[PDB]
Amino acid sequence: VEYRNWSKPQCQITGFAPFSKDNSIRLSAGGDIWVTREPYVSCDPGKCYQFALGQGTTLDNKHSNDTVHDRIPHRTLLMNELGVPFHLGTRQVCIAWSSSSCHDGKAWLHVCITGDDKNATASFIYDGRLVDSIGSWSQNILRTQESECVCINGTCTVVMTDGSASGRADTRILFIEEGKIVHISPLSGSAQHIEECSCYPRYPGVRCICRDNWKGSNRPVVDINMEDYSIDSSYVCSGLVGDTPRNDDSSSNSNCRNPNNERGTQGVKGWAFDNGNDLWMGRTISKESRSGYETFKVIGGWSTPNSKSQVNRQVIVDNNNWSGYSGIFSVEGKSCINRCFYVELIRGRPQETRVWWTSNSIVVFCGTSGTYGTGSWPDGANINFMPI
Amino acid sequence: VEYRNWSKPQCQITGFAPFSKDNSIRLSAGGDIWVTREPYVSCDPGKCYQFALGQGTTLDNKHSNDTVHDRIPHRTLLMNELGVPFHLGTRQVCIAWSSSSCHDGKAWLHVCITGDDKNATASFIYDGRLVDSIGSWSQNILRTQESECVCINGTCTVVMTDGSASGRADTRILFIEEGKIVHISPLSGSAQHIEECSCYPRYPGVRCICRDNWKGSNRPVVDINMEDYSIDSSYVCSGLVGDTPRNDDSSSNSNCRNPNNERGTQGVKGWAFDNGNDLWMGRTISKESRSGYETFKVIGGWSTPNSKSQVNRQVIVDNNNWSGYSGIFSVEGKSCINRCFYVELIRGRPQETRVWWTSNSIVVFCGTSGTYGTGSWPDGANINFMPI
Amino acid sequence: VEYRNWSKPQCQITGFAPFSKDNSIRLSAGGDIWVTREPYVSCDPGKCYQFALGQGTTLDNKHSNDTVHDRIPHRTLLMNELGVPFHLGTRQVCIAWSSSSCHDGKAWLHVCITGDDKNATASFIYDGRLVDSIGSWSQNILRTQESECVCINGTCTVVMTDGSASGRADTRILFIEEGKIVHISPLSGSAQHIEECSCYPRYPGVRCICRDNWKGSNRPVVDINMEDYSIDSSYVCSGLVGDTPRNDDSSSNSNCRNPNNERGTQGVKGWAFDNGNDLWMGRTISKESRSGYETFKVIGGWSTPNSKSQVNRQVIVDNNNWSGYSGIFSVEGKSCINRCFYVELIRGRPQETRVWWTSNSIVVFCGTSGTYGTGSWPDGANINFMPI
Amino acid sequence: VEYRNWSKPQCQITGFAPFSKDNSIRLSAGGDIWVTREPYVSCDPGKCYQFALGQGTTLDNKHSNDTVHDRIPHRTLLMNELGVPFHLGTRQVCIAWSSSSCHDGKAWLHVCITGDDKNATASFIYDGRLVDSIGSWSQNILRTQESECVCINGTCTVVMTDGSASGRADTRILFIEEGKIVHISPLSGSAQHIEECSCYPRYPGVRCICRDNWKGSNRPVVDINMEDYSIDSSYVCSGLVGDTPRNDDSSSNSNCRNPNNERGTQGVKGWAFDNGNDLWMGRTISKESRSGYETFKVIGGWSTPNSKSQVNRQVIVDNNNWSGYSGIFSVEGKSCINRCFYVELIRGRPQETRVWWTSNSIVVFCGTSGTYGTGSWPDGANINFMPI
Ligand SMILES: *[C@@H]1O[C@H](CO)[C@@H](O[C@@H]2O[C@H](CO)[C@@H](O[C@@H]3O[C@H](CO[C@H]4O[C@H](CO)[C@@H](O)[C@H](O)[C@@H]4O)[C@@H](O)[C@H](O[C@H]4O[C@H](CO)[C@@H](O)[C@H](O)[C@@H]4O)[C@@H]3O)[C@H](O)[C@H]2NC(C)=O)[C@H](O)[C@H]1NC(C)=O
Ligand SMILES: *[C@@H]1O[C@H](CO)[C@@H](O[C@@H]2O[C@H](CO)[C@@H](O[C@@H]3O[C@H](CO[C@H]4O[C@H](CO)[C@@H](O)[C@H](O)[C@@H]4O)[C@@H](O)[C@H](O[C@H]4O[C@H](CO)[C@@H](O)[C@H](O)[C@@H]4O)[C@@H]3O)[C@H](O)[C@H]2NC(C)=O)[C@H](O)[C@H]1NC(C)=O
Ligand SMILES: *[C@@H]1O[C@H](CO)[C@@H](O[C@@H]2O[C@H](CO)[C@@H](O[C@@H]3O[C@H](CO[C@H]4O[C@H](CO)[C@@H](O)[C@H](O)[C@@H]4O)[C@@H](O)[C@H](O[C@H]4O[C@H](CO)[C@@H](O)[C@H](O)[C@@H]4O)[C@@H]3O)[C@H](O)[C@H]2NC(C)=O)[C@H](O)[C@H]1NC(C)=O
Ligand SMILES: *[C@@H]1O[C@H](CO)[C@@H](O[C@@H]2O[C@H](CO)[C@@H](O[C@@H]3O[C@H](CO[C@H]4O[C@H](CO)[C@@H](O)[C@H](O)[C@@H]4O)[C@@H](O)[C@H](O[C@H]4O[C@H](CO)[C@@H](O)[C@H](O)[C@@H]4O)[C@@H]3O)[C@H](O)[C@H]2NC(C)=O)[C@H](O)[C@H]1NC(C)=O
Ligand SMILES: *[C@@H]1O[C@H](CO)[C@@H](O[C@@H]2O[C@H](CO)[C@@H](O)[C@H](O)[C@H]2NC(C)=O)[C@H](O)[C@H]1NC(C)=O
Ligand SMILES: *[C@@H]1O[C@H](CO)[C@@H](O[C@@H]2O[C@H](CO)[C@@H](O)[C@H](O)[C@H]2NC(C)=O)[C@H](O)[C@H]1NC(C)=O
Ligand SMILES: *[C@@H]1O[C@H](CO)[C@@H](O[C@@H]2O[C@H](CO)[C@@H](O)[C@H](O)[C@H]2NC(C)=O)[C@H](O)[C@H]1NC(C)=O
Ligand SMILES: *[C@@H]1O[C@H](CO)[C@@H](O[C@@H]2O[C@H](CO)[C@@H](O)[C@H](O)[C@H]2NC(C)=O)[C@H](O)[C@H]1NC(C)=O
Numbered sequence A, B, C, D: 001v002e003y004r005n006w007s008k009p010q011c012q013i014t015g016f017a018p019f020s021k022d023n024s025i026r027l028s029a030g031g032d033i034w035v036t037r038e039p040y041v042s043c044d045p046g047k048c049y050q051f052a053l054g055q056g057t058t059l060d061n062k063h064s065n066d067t068v069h070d071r072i073p074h075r076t077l078l079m080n081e082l083g084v085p086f087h088l089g090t091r092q093v094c095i096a097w098s099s100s101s102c103h104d105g106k107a108w109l110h111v112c113i114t115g116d117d118k119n120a121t122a123s124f125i126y127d128g129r130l131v132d133s134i135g136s137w138s139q140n141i142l143r144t145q146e147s148e149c150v151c152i153n154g155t156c157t158v159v160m161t162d163g164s165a166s167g168r169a170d171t172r173i174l175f176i177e178e179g180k181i182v183h184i185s186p187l188s189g190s191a192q193h194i195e196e197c198s199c200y201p202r203y204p205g206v207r208c209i210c211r212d213n214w215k216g217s218n219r220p221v222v223d224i225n226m227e228d229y230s231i232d233s234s235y236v237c238s239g240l241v242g243d244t245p246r247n248d249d250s251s252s253n254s255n256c257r258n259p260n261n262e263r264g265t266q267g268v269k270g271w272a273f274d275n276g277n278d279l280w281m282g283r284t285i286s287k288e289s290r291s292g293y294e295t296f297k298v299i300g301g302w303s304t305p306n307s308k309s310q311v312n313r314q315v316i317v318d319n320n321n322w323s324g325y326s327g328i329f330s331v332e333g334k335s336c337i338n339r340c341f342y343v344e345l346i347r348g349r350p351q352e353t354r355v356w357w358t359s360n361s362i363v364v365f366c367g368t369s370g371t372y373g374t375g376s377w378p379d380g381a382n383i384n385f386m387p388i
């Protein structure tokens, strides 16, 4: 087996087509299903897998109570084939309250973070064995992508942050060969806060669209040079911004370089990708809540500051339904590299207080060069039907 | 591994022998089992799989309530090895309220349709990745076979319809190579309405026996030329007709060319296949309801208009028990291609109102050149024992 | 992969050592587990599988009620790796209320019988597809081994009976190549009634120890010549007889040739095998009930009429616990062919009337040339703890 | 595939990083999960497996009552991929109330002991078949490691004891080739009592750190010469001793040669390993009870009698939480052999009497040459949330 190089052009797409849905919460009302959050998707050269952070319990289980909390020692990374819900036969790949995973063409890498807030440990597991680890560098919740890392020619990269969630922090970009950390580069450029990067191969390098939790409702960009380990960063140009919270479309701004200081504090994991001067992006439909999900293309959204002409919009989840995190993954076709995305569909607390748990299902779409229609694919569980 | 060509003679059979049964509904009363409908069977060159459309829920689950409806966003295509019931470890292959799947000798193709009635999307997934998609062309429930598609030398064909369920509609035949649509041919010939085709390889081409939902209780035939993409169509000659509803045997007719205008509106998915001048076919035992299931050979049933001499009848499901859709699949043997069929056994609403759900199990038979006896293999669940 | 020839000497053993146990009934009180009976074990060249006839339901399920009955349309053959209990992910291999399975070195053969008592059908499934079938020849419960068939050089043999359970019947020996019946030989020799054969390879032929349900408490022997399809039959010489019911050891007899007319009517499936002049055999400890299970070697038990000197006895299940059917399977080692056996542990009705179901677990032992101790490995469920 | 030789240097480590956690007990409160104890981990050359001794029942099941007992006929060895909890699809590999397993590079060996206390049987299963067996030699609970055995160049070694738990016993070291016992060496050297060895490859031989249940709270060492079958034994030098119970650190002693006669009676399975003159070891945090778990390096802990200078301590489980057995396993990396360990986390009786069962979950760490932080990873179940 050969290392992936992702050395094909990006598929020219017209939008996205339905790919997968797991119905986790509906199933949880009649079956033993893991409580999760922070899901993502990543594929080996043959097939795709769904991942999530378990909460060390199933939903219909008293331990599901107060699973709104992000960090407990019992969180583990779950991995199934895409479309297989997280049932009791699911493998817990590592201990993790924050993670990233990727396949380099030969084997899986998993980056798993657990332990004390002020002194966490990141474990690096490759091809079924622990190869490396690193401890917290800023003593304030060492944390990573919650989506797939990216490997080119046997070197995988992942973005990690340690430090304040509401002020300047310490972001580093790791380069890993067969599970071994071979280089660490500090964040460089104009991005001022980086969380939860959604990265993708853009041969010869890697590009990430992330979350600014401090001053920006525009999404930061991190560019990773795999030849020399140099880092650059900026913000997505589009005046239609991707974070939540954010200003309405008529009063939102981005200058490509600085955080916009528009409802900048807090955020949600998300994604976007460039195509020439244009930008494909997703976001919640609501400007303030993790509600709904839409995708569209922004004409000049990559190259032109404050561009706001969109086209090819698709509703993925209507605004009467809950969404959550979302992220990108890439899939190699015969001639081109395709871009796909998943959307986390969060149910329970804090928004729905009839139940005491917090969990999610997922829906997944992939880029298409063909045509498509309309729809809405929300979680679909009736909150009144659920065990509390 | 090589592409399938199905370039062997059809097996000469004497009837059918028991092959598989999943007991889905009996098991649902003591286990977490998916609610499904529209099942089918398809085999890779080594082994067979059962498929069905899930309803995004298990049976013993409040979400099973009112699952009689055909189209919701939570329907996904399920795929297990044949005989493995749809338990919680079942893979949801794609999002779909209508589907078709087939293996070309190298990899699986799945055709999955979901979304709004008036603006649906068909996704084409091959070897684990989304390769193509197409949107609705008549804005009225784009829909497909609910049984296996057929591939010859790397080109797979599938029949799809969009438009009225009770009048002229727009039927097209797609040719797909490794998930990529390479040609689309409009329906041609004398068939006037086409739904839910049951297709099979008949080298060098593909033949389908379908459902006319408009004016015929005789079943339409669609013939597909894989070399030049030409289409022809007609009706099964047999005066013993295959649809439900239909006239009594003494007053049913077919002229091989036109819908018979005998209780023609509505219908049920079904199958038949030719052997020289004769016809093997299945149908419900009841003339008006989806009750019972029988197979037989009609002497001159392929070539002689209105032929009514049957022989080699077998009861598959007695008329005191519910059936449902049925369809064909083909299995390559050492010297010949065999024909098999499945029967959907529908339980719950609208026929059985003690429970609020609608689901099914399956029974499966394959052609035999040997001998056999008699029996009846219905769903077998006691409606009074079920969770409602 | 090559066809099995079993052309090695039989392992010289000193007794048997513990190999597997599934605890099916204990687990059934806290989990969804199939209701079964008539289990057996058979191994491919790499690993062993457990088989049983399902009753189309799990135990904690209202459909488990009155599963004492031997024949319903919902019985299917289950197949898991040995030691994996029959959970809801278990594959139902075929429809069957009587079966036999075996691997020829290349693929699995399954012989599955279902349908009406007076007109049953036996299906032959090889390498995942239906290859042949045969109908009832005597119109009175066509039936077969309920343990493994045996293949030499690509030809598998299986023994089937059709006709009276309490008088002369019609027993035939089938020879099957890649699922295709190539020859059928009538029973010949002095055995007067044959049921439920436990067969094993004894290169160049196959030897079976069976059950006489009419006049013998001594077990019939069927010898199968694989070169010319000729059949011979007799009775096990040992004066310590293997069937249940039977006379006590002080008043039991066998002359090697005729049924002994000692408590001959009825019986239980069982096994024995020859080693030179000696015989290894198992049987229930009780002479009248399917209670307990013991094995031992009978000195001169193969060659000497009415021999009653035993040695190397082992208790497998003590006589305070229920047993049931038992049968042989053979496993190829580096230098020799080993003999193993399973014991069915039947719980529920008719012996235990607190519950309404009938089911079983299994325990499995293999021949050893080493040493061993003592024990008892019964089903182990507390009948008072079970769902009724 | 080739036999393992473990002919690489030991990885130089700085401590341990989180590797796996199964959350078995939390899950048992909302799912059907096996009752177990005495777990361990062992890896084939590609991936790791978790093993444990089942109690023939799930937790939420009346049969879980009084599962504190160590030996019943229904105990079987369970084997899943590491991180897959023991759900109902788990394979029971053999019948066993004491076990050891290991992979020689080609296939799995399992050593399974069951039967009467005074006359037990050890079965040896290799590559899926029973190859050998041995009976009890001292008629007093024949028993073995409860962790992985070790194979070099096709010979596997395992340590077994038979005899008193509180006085001199009969310990033997077996050498097994492809499941066949080829040599048995008696214990030799100065270790006076040996139980539950935790062994590891130390090319060209094998080294074990065990439990002295008679006179020592210092842990015995057994060294195994694989070339000539000679045995030597002693005690771990470290004055910080590894057993439980044990004296306080200020009053504990070891002289490397003899049991220390300090709270020596009883004990707990545990581990340690040498690196030059230093020692890496784990132990319960509590001196008298199986509570908490810590690891550290003892400077001079291998070579210097009574050394008590520790460094690089890590809390694995805080002392407010239950631990249990622990043991070592080795994983081959690219350049070196790494050492990992598991910790059994025992819940229920006798410590927690609200429930009537006794079971466990596990947590697993592996050696790292990188860095790490702090945490605590206990079982995590709320005893008040459990079925009793
Ligand atoms: C069946 O399904 C298809 C595929 O989903 C639908 O077609 C899509 O429809 C949407 C909505 O109309 C299109 O997305 C929109 O594109 C607009 C730009 O294109 C128009 O205007 C410019 C010039 O001004 C031209 O380039 C172009 O030719 C069009 O005339 C955007 O302006 C839209 O954004 C604005 O409206 C949306 C709400 O719709 C707001 O949320 C935004 O904030 C913004 O104000 C939007 O992006 C999409 O391009 C179409 N796709 C394709 C491939 O054609 C069909 O509509 C659907 N049919 C029905 C009846 O359901
Ligand atoms: C044990 O199992 C076997 C196999 O299933 C059964 O044999 C089958 O029996 C059925 C019913 O008799 C047969 O199917 C029937 O064939 C008839 C035609 O064949 C006869 O008549 C013509 C004369 O021209 C000859 O060609 C031929 O040789 C036969 O003499 C059809 O007329 C039947 O259809 C009519 O009756 C059925 C109800 O039975 C109605 O539903 C139809 O509408 C119609 O009126 C029917 O198709 C079948 O051919 C037999 N199979 C084989 C291979 O022999 C045994 O009967 C069964 N025994 C028992 C007691 O269970
Ligand atoms: C630890 O475990 C081992 C292995 O299981 C036990 O050893 C076995 O013990 C049984 C019972 O004694 C042995 O089986 C018996 O063999 C007898 C024949 O051998 C004896 O007598 C003849 C000469 O007469 C000699 O060949 C031989 O040397 C012996 O002296 C049979 O007579 C027995 O059958 C009779 O008794 C049984 C009940 O035990 C009745 O049920 C029968 O109907 C019959 O009347 C029996 O077959 C067996 O051979 C031993 N195995 C081995 C390998 O030695 C140990 O006993 C056990 N230790 C303890 C204390 O538990
Ligand atoms: C973030 O996480 C890291 C990694 O876990 C923690 O660093 C570890 O901290 C522990 C506790 O301090 C260290 O283990 C201890 O090492 C001591 C010896 O090392 C010091 O002293 C000698 C002087 O001769 C020097 O060799 C050496 O350089 C150090 O100066 C031992 O004495 C300790 O044992 C004693 O204390 C423990 C309780 O802590 C008792 O239980 C023992 O019985 C004994 O009395 C102990 O072994 C460990 O070495 C550190 N690891 C590394 C790699 O640096 C951070 O502390 C943590 N930070 C926070 C705030 O969480
Ligand atoms: C989830 O846990 C919370 C916190 O313990 C539970 O809320 C408490 O429930 C008790 C009843 O035992 C009340 O007396 C307290 O007043 C509650 N505290 C709070 C914060 O409201 C809650 O009941 C649990 N949920 C379930 C379904 O068990
Ligand atoms: C399935 O859903 C239907 C619709 O909600 C339920 O039927 C209703 O039950 C409510 C009481 O809860 C009544 O007020 C209505 O009269 C019913 N509506 C109809 C259409 O009959 C039904 O109870 C549900 N089934 C189950 C098992 O909960
Ligand atoms: C199993 O089925 C039997 C037969 O129906 C049940 O026995 C009957 O139960 C009813 C109660 O509904 C009694 O009125 C009848 O007298 C019973 N008949 C017999 C033969 O005793 C039995 O209850 C069922 N078992 C369970 C647990 O549901
Ligand atoms: C576990 O088993 C024990 C022993 O049978 C049960 O404890 C007994 O309960 C009975 C009543 O059913 C009392 O008569 C005895 O006093 C109890 N015996 C002891 C030793 O305390 C216990 O109830 C069982 N646990 C569960 C959950 O059923």
Ligand SMILES: [Ca+2]
Pocket (backbone or CB within 6 Å): A211, A212, A213, A214, A215, A216, A217, A243, A244, A245, A263, A264, A265, A266, A267, A268
């Ligand atoms: Ca923000």
Ligand SMILES: [Ca+2]
Pocket (backbone or CB within 6 Å): B211, B212, B213, B214, B215, B216, B217, B218, B243, B244, B245, B263, B264, B265, B266, B267, B268
């Ligand atoms: Ca019709």
Ligand SMILES: [Ca+2]
Pocket (backbone or CB within 6 Å): C211, C212, C213, C214, C215, C216, C217, C243, C244, C245, C263, C264, C265, C266, C267, C268
């Ligand atoms: Ca008899």
Ligand SMILES: [Ca+2]
Pocket (backbone or CB within 6 Å): D211, D212, D213, D214, D215, D216, D217, D218, D243, D244, D245, D263, D264, D265, D266, D267, D268
């Ligand atoms: Ca001790």
